[PDB]
A paper describes a structure:
To build an atomic model of 2-up+P86, we determined the crystal structure of P86 at 1.60 Å resolution. The asymmetric unit contained two structurally identical monomers (a root mean square deviation for Cα atoms of 0.20 Å); the three CDR regions were visualized well. We fit the P86 crystal structure to the density near the down-RBD in a locally refined map. The map showed two featured regions: a loop-like density between the down-RBD and the NTD of the neighbouring protomer and an elongated density located on the top. We fit the CDR3 and the C-terminal (C-ter.) region into the former and the latter, respectively, and the whole body was adequately accommodated. After manual model modifications, the P86 monomer fit well into the final sharpened map.
Nanobodies are small, stable, customizable, and inexpensive to produce. Herein, we present a panel of nanobodies that can detect the spike proteins of five SARS-CoV-2 variants of concern (VOCs) including Omicron. Here we show via ELISA, lateral flow, kinetic, flow cytometric, microscopy, and Western blotting assays that our nanobodies can quantify the spike variants. This panel of nanobodies broadly neutralizes viral infection caused by pseudotyped and authentic SARS-CoV-2 VOCs.
Residue numbers in the entry: 2 to 117
Write the structure that this text describes.
Amino acid sequence: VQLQESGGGLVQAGGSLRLSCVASGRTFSSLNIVWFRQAPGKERKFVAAINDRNTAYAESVKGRFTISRDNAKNTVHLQMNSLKPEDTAVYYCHSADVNGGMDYWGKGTQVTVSSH
């Protein structure tokens, strides 16, 4: 199936958005969630991951983005602060267990950052 995403939008540079990735099931705490993004004309690239409670960030977003999880609500959040036009992309979340099973994708949600 597919994961559910929300929180995208169009925002002035320097603004913030918070994306959500929501999964169904009873196994959410066992899932590792990864965010990817694709800017127009470019390839899909790693953004951030939460592996149990461990967090990892691409060099381009470290410090500005924070990934977190609320296992009680089956949700991972990506808080994006200090947004730049180069953060404009479709953002996708991906789930899996430790071996690479239980692997699902979200459809993608748009994040657009205008310059001043």
